[model samples]
Target: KVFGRCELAAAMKRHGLDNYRGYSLGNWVCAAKFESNFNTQATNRNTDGSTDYGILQINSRWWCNDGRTPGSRNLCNIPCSALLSSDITASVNCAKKIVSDGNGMNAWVAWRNRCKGTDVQAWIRGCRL
Candidate 1:
């Protein structure tokens, strides 16, 4: 499912990503924007042979177990397919879990390129009361 900004905002806030790690709801919404274009079923295959799955684009190279990545740590201890579920619990949980593990949002150029510099207040409040 592809989420509109407001739906994504509402969903993310409901799950606790708002102001998470001081990254702000907009940053996450931005991540969801460029990462997967807000599509829950989206997947990306990197040139380095890593597959990013779900709206969060959780990587198979280190986070989820895809049984294809040569030495995936499976640190999140979940199958990569779990990231694609429309339910989003696993995706959102692992999204924060990765940061909590000190896996910082550093590599996500998508966030830095846009949301990092601007205040994403609108995305959070696009449909917020």
Candidate 2:
């Protein structure tokens, strides 16, 4: 449910989210629902048609690019996606970075209010910040 302990720990570690005081599986699940819908192959393209690649919907060109196309394993090279991978917990890690880096987790709120609660839709919506 947590995408395996190692990936979950990797997600927590890389994002610096250390197991919070009272976190729960439901919270994580909700957050994942807000992130990627548990789908590894998800992606979104920008207005210019440049693709934001992979499960975490990483903007490879904007953040990090390993030379592969949008949805390939090369998308995994982006440090954020390294933790994010095709795993939902990985997407949570990316979401955490937005929060920790002062990007705010407003993406989640926007997903809830604007995009509703569909996982794939929320995944794209949550990529805003």
In candidate 2 the C-alpha lDDT for residue 52 amounts to 54
Q: Kindly list the per-residue Cα lDDT of model 2 for residues 33-91, writing each as its tens digit.
A: 44455445556656654555443355554454545545434323345345435444555
What does candidate 1's lDDT look like per residue over 1-27, in tens digits? 888888888888889988787677788
Work out candidate 1's RMSD over C-alphas: 1.5
By TM-score, the best candidate is 1
Model 1, TM vs. native: 0.91
Worst lDDT run of 10 residues, candidate 1, spans 120-129
Clashes of 1: 0
